Amino acid sequence: PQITLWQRPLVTIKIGGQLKEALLDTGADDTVLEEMSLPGRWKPKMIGGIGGFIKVRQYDQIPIEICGHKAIGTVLVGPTPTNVIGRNLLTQIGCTLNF
Amino acid sequence: PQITLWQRPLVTIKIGGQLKEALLDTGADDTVLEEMSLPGRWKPKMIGGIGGFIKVRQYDQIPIEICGHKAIGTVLVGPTPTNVIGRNLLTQIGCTLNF
Numbered sequence A, B: 001p002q003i004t005l006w007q008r009p010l011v012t013i014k015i016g017g018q019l020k021e022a023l024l025d026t027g028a029d030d031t032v033l034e035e036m037s038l039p040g041r042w043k044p045k046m047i048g049g050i051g052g053f054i055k056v057r058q059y060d061q062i063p064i065e066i067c068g069h070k071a072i073g074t075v076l077v078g079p080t081p082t083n084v085i086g087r088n089l090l091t092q093i094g095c096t097l098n099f
């Protein structure tokens, strides 16, 4: 699809069998989701946003569908203001910016 | 242009007679730049991201050129860790997400 930016680019994602709403965010290196349960072991990561730094849980190799497009990659879980899909997964689904 | 998301999508902007590098950020409602002088009225704003909020000055009706494309809009100025071009200006240069 082609998504214009007059509104927030919110899409439906599916992760762990559940649907959620997430923001397609070309300014984000990483994908960060609000608190949820994921399988397996996690590693620590400190990520920086416009307000400062937060600690998150890093899960690797997680299947996630984004607008119907299948991806499998690193998902960070922590106290983010919104679910954000970053470039690590935007590249998996073949996203570019065009103007 | 078509801009890949393998790397951060950084572009050159011209604003207030200055050249600066900024990140094209579909996740950002607003355009926010590191401290600089701009002419005209402003009012204070709090803006929130990962890690919480920062206080910025909001300037309206500011001319900007982004990757060669002229636009005008609101520019927020304050202690952002990095220069971000948000949707308010991305729309004006006809920037879309595509996959």
Ligand SMILES: C=CCNC(=O)[C@@H](NC(=O)[C@@](O)(CCCN(Cc1ccc(Br)cc1)NC(=O)[C@@H](NC(=O)OC)C(C)(C)C)Cc1ccccc1)C(C)(C)C
Binding pocket: A023, A025, A027, A028, A029, A030, A031, A032, A047, A048, A049, A050, A081, A082, A084, A086, B025, B026, B027, B028, B029, B030, B031, B032, B047, B048, B049, B050, B081, B082, B084, B086
């Ligand atoms: C939600 C209300 C509106 N709120 C914004 O609309 C705000 N938008 C945002 O905060 C975001 O779009 C992110 C802006 C881009 N940011 C640049 C950045 C780069 C380095 C450092 Br150190 C600090 C900042 N990237 C990040 O934070 C990411 N870090 C990063 O990749 O490390 C390299 C991450 C933490 C999301 C992974 C995300 C966002 C979107 C919507 C809401 C909240 C957050 C606003 C426009 C007001 C700044």
Ligand SMILES: [Cl-]
Binding pocket: A072, A073, A074, A088, A089
């Ligand atoms: Cl990944």
Ligand SMILES: [Cl-]
Binding pocket: B072, B073, B074, B088, B089
């Ligand atoms: Cl504007």
Ligand SMILES: [Cl-]
Binding pocket: A004, B094
């Ligand atoms: Cl349009």
